[PDB]
Structures are given as structure tokens and as C-alpha cells.
Amino acid sequence: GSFVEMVDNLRGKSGQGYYVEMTVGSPPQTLNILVDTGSSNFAVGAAPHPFLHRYYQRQLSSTYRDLRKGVYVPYTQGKWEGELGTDLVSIPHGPNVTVRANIAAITESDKFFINGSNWEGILGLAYAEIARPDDSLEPFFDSLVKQTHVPNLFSLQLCGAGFPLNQSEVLASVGGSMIIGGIDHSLYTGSLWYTPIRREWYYEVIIVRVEINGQDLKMDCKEYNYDKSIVDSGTTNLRLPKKVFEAAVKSIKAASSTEKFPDGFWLGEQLVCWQAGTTPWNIFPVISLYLMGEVTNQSFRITILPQQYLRPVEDVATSQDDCYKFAISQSSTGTVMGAVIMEGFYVVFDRARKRIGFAVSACHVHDEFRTAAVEGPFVTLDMEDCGYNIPQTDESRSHHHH
Ligand SMILES: CN1C(=O)[C@]2(CC(C)(C)Cc3ccc(-c4cncnc4)cc32)N=C1N
Ligand code: NI
What we know:
- Belongs to the peptidase A1 family.
- The active site is at 36, 232.
- Strands 2-3-8-4-7-6 form a 6-stranded mixed β-barrel.
- It is built from 6 helices and 25 strands.
- The longest helix has 14 residues, at 242-255.
- It has helices at residues 140-147, 242-255, 263-266, 306-309, 339-342, 394-398; strands spanning 10-13, 18-24, 29-36, 42-45, 65-74, 79-90, 99-110, 121-124, 154-159, 173-180, 188-196, 207-212, 215-216, 229-231, 238-241, 272-275, 287-292, 298-304, 310-312, 321-326, 328-331, 335-337, 345-350, 355-361, 373-379.
- The chain folds into 2 domains: 18-150, Beta Barrel (Cathepsin D, subunit A, domain 1), CATH 2.40.70.10; 151-402, Acid Proteases (Cathepsin D, subunit A, domain 1, Beta Barrel).
- By secondary structure, the chain is mainly β.
- The structure holds ligand 1M7 and nickel (II) ion.
């Protein structure tokens, strides 16, 4: 349970994703690649772009092979598109292996790259079912496991930022670890608790209960997972279904009522500040998500602090103060346990055993009174089915799966 070479191999800027160094081609071309458990394509910038100072140059690689097939990926925010191919890929601060993987060479995009994020591509770590153009395009991790002796598991320790912040001109730097093929015991303390992967597409899980400062939200538990709940390193926020979001905001507002913030703050569109070092952490409640256990009728809870859901943003004009963005937001596509959740925990994506593990992170931000926690078991007599069944569209139904 030691993977020293892979420790601290993640970097990034607060709110702009965590990236790992990868190489593509022969000889190896280094790129910084966003670690994304909410998508399934390995897609890299492969043409000039205003926000890229470098890109994958297919012509420089002796081992590049064109698949003679394009790929077009629209999404809520924007789109990326390009040409499919294969090449040799390695992770310099990962396993000592080289694999031939599918690579989508991005030739055109809109609102994909982020000015100053310092990453040039995305490593989709989710399953084939959500790959583009379709599930026949083998994802990177599938190729890694098939071609090498790497165990079918990876783990993420995402370490967030905190005041005092170093710089007033740039965003806060973040760090973390992606351990490929194993669990590094130095990255967590206490017990490691597992929740089943409900279905292998996203890393989908089931939330059975939600508490805000130990107060149950008392909703039909299907509401917590409407229309899914997923663990996504490629989302910054904790994102909650509309009804759940509204209930949570009401509870957090009530707990923090000594302070009256503008509506903009609760919408994530405005910062609130306190004089350096005086942030009243204790007026903001803890949030507990109970996840279905491996055993029927069991659950465990992960508990996060305001140090996780209030994101530090240093303002140029207000550099004397500690300022924060509310990082819980409304979803219409289910619960997303993003960086806000993941920064509290060491998270084990145990694909081999179709389960996700959580343990208290050795790097999580906390104070002397409260800590992020992972606690269980909680037993429920005749526990209900909290899973939602997404209505089946005709187009989805028409798909053949040979
Ligand atoms: C929710 N989600 C996305 O919208 C997506 C979809 C994708 C098509 C891969 C394009 C993309 C680009 C940047 C970020 C990003 C991530 N973190 C910070 N800033 C931007 C996230 C994503 N991947 C995920 N998981
Ligand atoms: Ni058929």
C-alpha cells in the first residue's frame, strides 16, 4: 500500500479542474490533462488555440495512426470536435507502462479550453457506455488494464486551497494525487467505506439520506438521486436536484442566519468576505450524505464542512479580506458529487469490484472544532429503493448492443 512515485502528481487552479501530466506519441510529447471521472473520452488539443501554448502534433509522432473517423461532442456549455486516432500514451508520474490508446485530436472547440487552467486535454475515466461517438471507442483506462498488468482500480486525493492565499493576481493553485492501480494508505486516515457502483456508465451511486447540521431533510430518498447521483472530478461544485437544492439552501440559510448575504451569494454569482482570518466557520452547518452500503440495509455517511462548500477566491481590490463563493448549485440532471465533495476524502474507484470507496483525506481543509468524516454503519430496517429509473426513450431503446 505504497505508491510514492504517484503521490502529488496532480496540479491545477481552483475551480478549473485537476490535471495530470501525460505523454502522447513517439518520442513522448508532454501535455497537461484534466482528470475527469464524469466523461469517457481521451481528447487532446491538436490545433492552435488562443488558450493553448502547446498541442498534440500528430505529424511529430512516428507511432500515430489515423482512424479516419471524426467525432463531434456538444454539451451544455459548448462543444469539442476532431479526428479519432491511436498513439502511444504514458503517465510519467504514474505506472511504468506505455499503452496504445484512442486519442481524439481536437481540431475545433467552443468553451472547452479555459484561459489559464494550464491543461490541454481531458482524460475521461468513466465507462464505455458514455464514450463518443459510441461505446465501441475504448476509453483510456480500459486500454490500460487490457494491455498491462495494472489492477482495474484508481484512486483520487484532491486537495483544495485555503487562506492565507499566496497570490492576489492569480487563482489559488491546488494539488493532489491520482494513484493508478492501487490504494496508498498514507493518503487517508480511519476506515475506508464502500458504496456500490449502481451502473457502469457514469460512476453512479445511491444516496439514501441527507442531513444538514444533523437535521434530516426528510425527502423521498428517490429525490436525492433524481435522475442520477454521480461522483465527478470534472465538476467543481456539489450539484443538487432542484427540490433538494432548495431544501438545502433553506437549511444552510437558517443555520447561518446571523449573517444576511445577498441572493447573488446563494446563486454562486457573488462573493462574501470577512477580514482575514475571522471567517465565522461555526455559523455554517455540516452536510452529510448517506450512501448505500455494500450490505443490504446498511449505509455510511460522508460529512463535509463549510471549508469544502465555501470556495476561497482572493479578490484584487479586496486582498486584505478572505472572500468565498458558495459552491453548492442547482442541477436538472441529478446529484453531482464534484470537487467540493471529493476534496474532503480519499476516493477509490474500484472498478474491479464495482464500488466506490471513501475515507477521510489526510489533506482535507478543516479546523480545531470539526473535521470531514466518514462514519458507519447505519442500519435501516427494510431500507427502501432510493434509485431512480430514467424514462426509456425510443432512440435509446432502438440501440442494438452486440
Ligand atoms: C461536468 N463535466 C463537464 O462539463 C465536462 C464535459 C466535457 C465534454 C468533458 C467538457 C468539459 C470541459 C471542462 C470541464 C471542467 C472541469 N472542471 C473545471 N472546469 C471545467 C468539464 C467538462 N466534464 C465533466 N465532468
Ligand atoms: Ni442488431
